[model samples]
Target chain A: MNFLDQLDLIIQNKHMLEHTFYVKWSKGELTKEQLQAYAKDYYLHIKAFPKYLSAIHSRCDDLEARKLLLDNLMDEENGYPNHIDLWKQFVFALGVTPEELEAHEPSEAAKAKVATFMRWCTGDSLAAGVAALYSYESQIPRIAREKIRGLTEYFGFSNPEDYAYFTEHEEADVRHAREEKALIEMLLKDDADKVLEASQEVTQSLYGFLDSFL
Target chain B: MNFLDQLDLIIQNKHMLEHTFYVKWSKGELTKEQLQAYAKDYYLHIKAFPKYLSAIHSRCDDLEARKLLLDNLMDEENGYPNHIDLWKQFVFALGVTPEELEAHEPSEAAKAKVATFMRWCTGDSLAAGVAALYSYESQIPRIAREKIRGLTEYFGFSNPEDYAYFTEHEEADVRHAREEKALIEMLLKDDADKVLEASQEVTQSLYGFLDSFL
Candidate 1:
């Protein structure tokens, strides 16, 4: 398949993960306690990101491609507040304390999904890792925007401060999705095999993530 | 020291390296054969960058920082023909060919400097790695602008095509350097020891690079 087609397929598949999560969360199906538990476990996914890119860098022949990946890694390692901070923010939004987040344990499905993501990122090729990221990030903005709308309209979450975590993602993920598309295009331009592999891995990972909520 | 003082010291020290190389190149201290060798050997340094950033990504902690670095790395990696390509332009300006560049081997000093840089980056902390990058990227605008002025006024580089590498840097490195500075600040704000160590390592590496030319 062509680059755009491959990208479209990846995005289409990953959207399912967002849809499932949103449906569960908005319907108040998952407890606030469960969301808090999920937040704490999500740290594993953010922390393991660099490993995924390193795998890609190890095999890539192009200097430019390698530089792109390295820069992304640098951002992951050095950026402000870290993911734990974001997790704390989520917990606070849920009216819980930092200690609560630290002490909470994730459900079996959440733990499995998080572990699976880590393994795929660390063990998969660059294309695979990028695909996974593309899926996750692509879903975030839409999910976040929808959450903001839902909270304001249905949930009476009037204070923006309470929903800052979701609001941030609304802006952040749009830029991320665009850039991932560009990177994927760059990597897959001449190689159909690599493109298909990346696309498949991305879709499968998204499905894996969705199976948890389902 | 404060961030500004630390940054100034690092930049000044790294400038010494560039000065050493400039003097060596301008004095015709090397034979035409030696210059050709230098060009080829330098290619490895220019080429290996993308992979290095990819490695850095594997270790990163922040998603925003990862995104920022990725943008910069993309500028270096995928933006254009790259530094080696620029060297090719320089070679062409001097009426040389790719075959000649490939055949030539640089002086031991040049090779050592390149190898040393590779080791420093691969071995050093991310903060230090960024500081080292700042030294080179930070210098580009000044060097390119100067070259542009000279080429346009005195040197027979009338067509801007002969100096595309320089021209690109003239406009690009300002944004690149600013991003680097912001990144260093962002990474080092909470971690003073890493800031100090990174600053020192970057400055020392820059001096070491200069010593190679000497």
Candidate 2:
């Protein structure tokens, strides 16, 4: 298949993973302790994000691509607070302290899953890294946009700040995902081996992240 | 000097370069031929921008950074309609078609400078590469905002669409640039050599781009 077709297939499968995750989380069936645990583990994964971008940026060969990567890295590192900060907002809604949140460690399962994903990206080809990122965030914008509407309409999570991270990603991730898909297509257009490797690695890494929650 | 001090010095130097270029262009000192030449060459350089960002995305490690870069790049590639599109916007505005504007080729000098700049970033380090982009693009917001005032108040180039690119850049570049500076500072805080190299390369690249006009 051509690059776009491959993208479509991968994105379709990723959508299933995200849909399942969101469904479980929003069901409000998990205990408060369970939600807090998820937050602590997920936050650990996010806090190491900028370093990952720096690693990938070190390996790229294109100027525009490098600039884009750098700019995005900046946004994550310094862009108006961050997911961790936003998580603090959520944790505060639960009456958690900043010190407590900072001190929280990821569960062993969560840490292993996150570390493995990082290894897959940093240890593998750059294309694989891009594909893995695309699998998670690309799913976010659409999911979050819908969730935003549902949060207010169906779930009754009323404060915008409480969902700021979701709302922001919902708008932002759609554009980002499209751009990454375009980049992956351009990078791997002529090479099937590269494409297959990236495809396999991304799919596996994403599944690994998802399986951690289960 | 510390990273912030180094950044301040680099920005100050770049501001002087930008001032000199603007003064030369605005004083009716450039031949009409030179003005068109500048536009033609600049158009070509920018045309390659989306493709470049796509390349960086392929190699970036941070999902958040990668995602953010993709969105910013797309906005740059396909932002709002603006005053620059107006038929009678400026001295040579009547004859320039969007197709003509977009299709121009960079002069060899322009191409070499751009290629060199890109290589410096993609080849050396991401932090250094980001510093270079931030140096140039960060200046745009203030310049563009002033240009908007000048166009409407002094130049009589009143159409907003005729200046959409500027308007977009004015706001967007500020946010992008600020974010870039933060990341560069954070990443290079402990490594003085890396910090100095990043600042120096960024300053050089901006001057290099301006020198192409000469």
Candidate 3:
């Protein structure tokens, strides 16, 4: 039923998701400021994402693919209760002011991860970038569940906006990831290894950032 | 049913394709060798087109779009009987050997036209190249019909293989063109003119090449 059926296996081969950072982060040991600081890095990725989409869109000649991209971009930029506004609410809840979020510089780990992702998207083949996206997005549901559970069950207040970002992602990112997997399948038809390489690299970059916290 | 419902109007705006070459070529005033030599130029475009497809594919991050491109490429490179083989048959029918076709240099107009098209495919946005493809391909059935009419009514050819190339395009290109139009519509969104510009440029190039023979 799926084209890129091997997508899960490729990520499983990396096994980076089970690294020490997740073990620590999921334990509720990290402070709110620490998690919010990471949010700034996440925001950097979210912000650069539109530019990435445009870059990919520029190279696509297929109507269906272009249509899918346009839809994804619409979601990212203006998906009702747009992504930026949703993230901002969570940022504010973490006690990070707009000014602080705007003025801040992402950590070295965050910067490297984003730079690596951007490079894959802009320079590599569509498969590579789509593979990278699949790797990141596919993990969102589980990550969102953990984050939401920790926020509600652990030390946090009960505000809707604070959890709104994860809520959107918990559902939406799965669709995004499914679309990405199909794309990765199409692109990986001839060069599964190349796509696999990109997926692994981006995963390593993401996990490396998380690993830094540990 | 179509987002690109304005396609006909957009195509109408082009006002291309009714050049002197078609008028003469259809009337059988153009010599066999003359058309074949021009076919050599046409072949050049056909051969190099996969690279352009790849260029667009590289930029595409959408899976559906990528799948469409992959299918198109599979058709161009190895669709059923393969476009190259089909075209080679036509080239041979004109008494031009593959060697001569390879060694032959195109006329200034042909060169200029292809050069313009290559630049547009490689450098311009996705909409530009896809639109360019749409403009040329959309009229294929009509163009093929005219060419076939001349072959049957005026030209002394009787072999089905001699006209196989045109016959194939007469039917297949319409599907391709329709898909491209939809793609251009999606990409053009508000920038229909941008894609229209590419379509016009490529169309003008094609007509100008035909005029060079006149």
Measured against the true two-chain complex, the DockQ scores of the candidates, in the order shown, are 0.27, 0.05, 0.05
RMSD to truth, every model: 7.4, 7.7, 10.3
What is the alpha-carbon lDDT for the whole of candidate 3?
0.70
lDDT of 2 by residue, B15-77 (tens): 733555666644434454655565566654454444444444444455455545555554554
**Prediction 2 global C-alpha lDDT:** 0.58
| lDDT tens readout by residue for model 2, A1-214 | 4755775576676564355555665554434565556666677666655555555554555545655665555555544566656656766665566787778866776566556556645644666666656665666777677656655654457678887777667676777777767656554435545545555555555555555665
Off by over 4 Å in 1: A1-55, A63-214, B17-20, B24-34, B79-87, B100-124, B145-156, B189-214
Give me the candidate number with maximum DockQ.
Answer: 1
What's the CA error at residue B174 for candidate 2, in Å? 7.3
lDDT of 3 by residue, A23-131 (tens): 5566766677667767777777766665455556545545356446645655665434677778878888888889999888877887888777778777658777777
Model 1 residue B122 lDDT? Answer: 53
Model 2 spans > 4 angstroms off:
A1-36, A46-97, A106-134, A137-188, A191-196, A209-214, B1-26, B44-78, B82-94, B115-130, B137-188, B211-214
Which docking category, incorrect, acceptable, medium or high, applies to candidate 1?
acceptable
**In model 2, what is the error at residue B37, expressed in angstroms?**
1.5
lDDT of each: 0.60, 0.58, 0.70
Q: Can you give the lDDT of residue A31 in candidate 2?
A: 48
